[PDB]
């Protein structure tokens, strides 16, 4: 196991967003050409084991631990009836006080806020990726595709990501092999060697959230200078075509920085190898 390895993301230009937005409210449009300098990205979502090394080293108490609760999806026991703020739900206790991470050391860390994610990444000699870096990397060297691997959800009849199958939220069939999270090294890599960049856990980025984008070409953009929500990307094991069609690289959503949930995690990036 080497679940803190990073891969080199090459310098390049890419089309961020899409002129065929599927969730227009989220500012997926307009497509815009963005130049990204070479940098490093974590191959994997940060896992429970890796986060635990952080907490062991620093003594860090996460915001959900300090608040005393976090959001859990009802199906595994609000912004929807199926989101419940559960007392004692946190990264070590992902469905509440009588759940554990002991049997899932290699799954992505959950119930970490934007601040928690910044603390970890900076501890690791790293940082969060910008939205642009995140999306460029998600796209894995392909131009204007829906998904990291292309435009078919199940290429060659194979599942390529951990999302929802069945009738959301009543029934998750587990067709893809996982109802909740999967190990961070599950499913094929994209063309840059990244795992689970769509699906599994949502992923925090550094950017403040806006839905207002210029078509202007930009270089290593950092997003808007102010805001109230930070940008998350890539969707989760809860995502489905019918309600949360956000397991696309162009997709995007947001939460306040002190937010945490049973489907939200992160990975880090770095300018140089730490």
Ligand X SMILES: *[C@@H]1O[C@H](CO)[C@@H](O[C@@H]2O[C@H](CO)[C@@H](O)[C@H](O)[C@H]2NC(C)=O)[C@H](O)[C@H]1NC(C)=O
- Give the residue with the Cβ less far from Ca ion, 62 or 196: 196
Q: Strand 6-9: give its sheet, edge to edge.
A: 6-9, 39-42, 269-270
Burial class of residue 154 (count of CB atoms within 10 Å of its CB; 0-12, 13-18, 19+) = exposed
Q: Which residues of 206-238 are buried (b: 16+ CB within 10 A; e: fewer)?
A: bbbbeeebeeeeeeebebeeeeebbbbbbbbbb
Instruction: Indicate the residue among 57 and 256 with the shorter CB distance to ligand X.
Output: 57
Residue appearing with tokens 């984008």:
213
**Dihedral sign, CA of 73, 74, 76, 77?**
positive
Q: Binding residues for ligand X, how many (CB under 6 A)? A: 4
Shortest distance in whole angstroms from residue 234 CB to Ca ion: 5
Quick one: which of 2, 24, 25, 56 contacts ligand X (CB under 6 A)? 56
> According to the binding rule CB under 6 A, does residue 145 interact with ligand X?
no
Q: CB-wise, 22 or 49, nearer to ligand X?
A: 49
Element (H, E) at 15: strand 12-16
49 binds, among ligand X, Ca ion, none (CB under 5 to 8 A by kind): ligand X
Minimum separation from the CB atom of position 137 to Ca ion (A): 12
- Give the x/- contact pattern for Ca ion in 185-214, rule: CB under 5 A: -----------x---xx-------------
Report the alpha-carbon distance of residue 261 to residue 44 in Å, rounded: 19
- Least distance between ligand X and beta carbon 102 (Å): 9
Other CB atoms within 10 A of residue 66 CB = 9
Question: Among ligand X, Ca ion, none, what does residue 86 contact (CB within 5–8 Å per kind)?
Answer: none
Binding site for Ca ion (CB under 5 A): 162, 176, 178, 196, 200-201, 234, 237
Binding site for ligand X (CB under 6 A): 49, 52-53, 56
């Amino acid at each position: 196991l080497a679940h803190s390895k990073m891969v080199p993301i090459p310098a390049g230009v890419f089309t961020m967003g899409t002129d065929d937005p599927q969730i227009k409210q989220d500012g997926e449009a307009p497509a815009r050409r963005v130049t990204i300098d070479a940098f490093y990205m974590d191959a994997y979502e940060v896992s429970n084991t890796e986060f635990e090394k952080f907490v062991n080293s620093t003594g860090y108490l996460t915001e959900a631990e300090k608040f005393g609760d976090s959001f859990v999806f009802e199906g595994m026991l609000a912004a929807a009836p199926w989101w419940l703020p559960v007392k004692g739900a946190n990264w070590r206790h992902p469905e509440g006080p009588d759940s554990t991470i002991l049997h899932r050391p290699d799954h992505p860390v959950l119930h970490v806020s934007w601040n928690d994610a910044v603390a970890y990444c900076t501890w690791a000699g790293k940082r969060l990726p910008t939205e642009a870096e995140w999306e460029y990397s998600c796209r894995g060297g392909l131009h204007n595709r829906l998904f990291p691997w292309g435009n078919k959800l199940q290429p060659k009849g194979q599942h390529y990501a951990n999302i929802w199958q069945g009738e959301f939220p009543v029934t998750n069939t587990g067709e893809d092999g996982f109802q909740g999270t999967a190990p961070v090294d599950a499913f094929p890599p994209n063309g840059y060697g990244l795992y689970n960049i769509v699906g599994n856990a949502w992923e925090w980025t550094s950017d403040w959230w806006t839905v207002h984008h210029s078509v202007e070409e930009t270089l290593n953009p950092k997003g808007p200078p102010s805001g109230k929500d930070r940008v998350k990307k890539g969707g989760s094991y809860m995502s489905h075509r019918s309600y949360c069609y956000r397991y696309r690289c162009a997709a995007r959503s947001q939460n306040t920085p002190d937010s945490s949930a049973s489907n939200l995690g992160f990975r880090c990036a770095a300018d140089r190898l730490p």
